[PDB]
């Protein structure tokens, strides 16, 4: 119950929304670590699948308002 994947959130592309995706995986649930890229719409996060999951990661940014995807 501890996986780490990357995320593709083209929902935006500047110093403000992609970084929000970082706040999304950090607020997704079991996220244990996060490291994305602003304008480079790319979030790489680690977490505990016991309470979260690669799906919940793309869903956290998708919930921030940035319909993204995942590609561990
Ligand atoms: Hg932005």
CA atoms within 13 A on the CB side of 62: 12
Residue set of the binding site for Hg(2+)? 14, 17
Name residues whose C-beta falls within 8 Å of residue 10's C-beta, 6 or more positions apart in sequence. 41, 68
Q: Which of 25, 27, 30 is nearest to 51 (CA)?
A: 30
- Domain ranges for the chain, please list them: 1-72
Question: Ligand 1 centre and the CA of 18: distance in Å?
Answer: 6
Q: How far apart are CA 63 and CA 67, in angstroms?
A: 8
Q: How far apart are CA 18 and CA 3, in angstroms?
A: 21
Method underlying the structure: NMR
Residue 45, φ and ψ in degrees, nearest 5: -130, 155
What is the whole-number distance in angstroms between the Cα of residue 16 and the centre of ligand 1? 4
39 φ/ψ sector (left φ>0, alpha ψ -120 to 50, else beta)? alpha
Q: How far apart are the CA of 13 and the centre of ligand 1, in A? A: 6
The answer regarding whether domain 1-72 maps to CATH 3.30.530.20 reads no
State residue 13 phi and psi, 5-degree precision.
Answer: 180, 70
Nearby residues for ligand 1 (ion, Cβ within 5 Å): 12, 14, 16-17
């Amino acid at each position: 119950a501890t996986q780490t994947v990357t995320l593709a959130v083209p929902g935006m592309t500047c110093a403000a929304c992609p970084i929000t995706v970082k706040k999304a995986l950090s607020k997704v649930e079991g996220v244990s670590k996060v490291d994305v890229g602003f304008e480079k719409r790319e979030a790489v996060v680690t977490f505990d699948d016991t309470k979260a999951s690669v799906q919940k990661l793309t869903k956290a940014t998708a919930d921030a308002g940035y319909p993204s995807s995942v590609k561990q």
